């Protein structure tokens, strides 16, 4: 059920998007399969212009189905904006449980709209699968007992290696400690706020944003573990699949194995980056509320 495999992103204030994780992995898998299939032979390299154009057509059709939930998604953005801003004239200062109920109800409607369009998304996914497998089935060798692996090598060098270097230049585990330190600082402040104030609207707003940041952190932690596991696996596997020959059936298996590893890595790297953006966009607004409490109001 894709209803339990959707990540929600809020990369900038007033913006919200969703990713159906198995659809993102599935589309990315067939993209690697399509590029590996045309880079296997020198004479098919020119097909990359067609592959690039076809992926854009897939992305445009997929986004069009996603846009059918825009009114429901915009209603969720409105609710979040009201719940996060005490100065919103519509923020009626309702109990934290009532705030959570409204937000969960609006979020449920977005997930229901997404589930309602599953068939539409599936038709697009199945076309991307056909596109990639069509090229894969065309792959050929002069001698099927000595197939070249230059396509696997060229594809890794030109499409994947830059992504591995980018992850290795970052310190994803230190990003996790930095986020945990921010959550702890907000938790210490929140307890101290309750001692001073009774049933203050800022306590409810801070609890609301802090709860959202805890969930974003958990998803970043979940995706970071996949990134760390997959960066090592890809580096170890790529060495076994290049500068050598394979029998065609084994070459085909290696291409599918590599596409599988790349898609799991890419899915989590892409989602971790958007979730990182979301965490810090929420923390800026939360820190603005802290400064308002401490330095604007004396408190």
């Amino acid at each position, epitope marked *: 059920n894709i209803a339990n495999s959707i990540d929600i992103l809020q990369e900038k204030e007033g913006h919200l998007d969703f990713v159906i994780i198995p659809h993102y992995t599935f589309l990315d898998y067939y993209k690697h399969l399509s590029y590996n299939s045309i880079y296997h032979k020198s004479s098919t390299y020119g097909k990359y212009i067609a592959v690039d154009a076809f992926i854009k057509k897939i992305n445009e059709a997929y986004d069009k189905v996603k846009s059918k939930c825009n009114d429901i998604k915009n209603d969720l953005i409105a609710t979040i904006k009201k719940l996060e801003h005490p100065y919103d004239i519509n923020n009626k200062n309702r109990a934290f449980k009532k705030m959570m109920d409204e937000y969960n109800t609006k979020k449920k409607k977005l997930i229901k709209c997404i589930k309602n369009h599953e068939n539409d998304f599936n*038709k*697009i996914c199945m*076309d991307m699968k056909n596109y990639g497998t069509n090229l894969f089935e065309q792959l050929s060798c002069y001698n099927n007992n000595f197939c070249n692996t230059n396509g696997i090598r060229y594809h890794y060098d030109e499409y994947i290696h830059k992504l591995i270097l980018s992850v290795k230049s970052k310190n994803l585990n230190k990003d996790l400690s930095d986020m945990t330190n921010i959550l702890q600082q907000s938790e210490l402040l929140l307890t101290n706020l309750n001692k001073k104030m009774g049933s203050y609207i800022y306590i409810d707003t801070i609890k609301f944003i802090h709860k959202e940041m805890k969930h974003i952190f958990n998803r970043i932690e979940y995706h970071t573990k996949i990134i760390n596991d997959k960066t090592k696996i890809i580096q170890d596997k790529i060495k076994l699949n290049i500068w050598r020959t394979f029998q065609k059936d084994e070459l085909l298996k290696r291409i599918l194995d590599m596409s599988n590893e790349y898609s799991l890595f890419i899915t989590s790297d892409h989602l971790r980056q958007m979730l990182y953006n979301t965490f810090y966009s929420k923390e800026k607004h939360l820190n603005n509320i802290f400064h308002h409490l401490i330095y604007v109001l004396q408190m």
Partner: single-chain antibody
Amino acid sequence: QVQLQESGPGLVKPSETLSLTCTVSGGPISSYYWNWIRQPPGKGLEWIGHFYHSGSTNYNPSLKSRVTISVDTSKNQFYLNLSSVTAADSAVYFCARQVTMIQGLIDSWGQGMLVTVSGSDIQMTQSPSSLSASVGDRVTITCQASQDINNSLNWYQQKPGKALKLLIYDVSNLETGVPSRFSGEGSGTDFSLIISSLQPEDIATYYCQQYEALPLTFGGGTKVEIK
């Protein structure tokens, strides 16, 4: 390469169902689109329907009440069953392979087989019906759609006695191996196929085809000959 071959009775009585088989070789039925297209003598190409994604079907609404398209994955074949048949169903029947509807081009066509029987559509206006030109002449064939079809337009070439083949896809993209003297232009409702300098090997019938909406529809065709 993937190859398609039609087979079945060439003569059908009005009391019998027109029943054809397409045997696929060089590749599997799998989740691809398996089409049946027909061409009544002297008339244009008519898309009958397709089986796709390992279980679904889209039929032309003009034939939907009397058509079935099915597969047998163990034999790697697909079938056409057209009932309530009349002399109007006499046509060359083609089976054709298609990979996606996102980019609705037909990439493999069977040679075709003659079978003799004893308003919402996007209308593709192709012109001229026939053309006669000298070697080195510029040739412009037009396709005008009754509705906006964005860039969802393809061109096919049918050389004498050969199967139809993809020439240009998505208005201006050349299929692999097609010479640079061919080009395609247009957008929305107006499209053109241009042969900058006609060569003897270009003698063929050309067809435009839209995939913006179902049913898939084709232009009436343009026969090009040397004068």
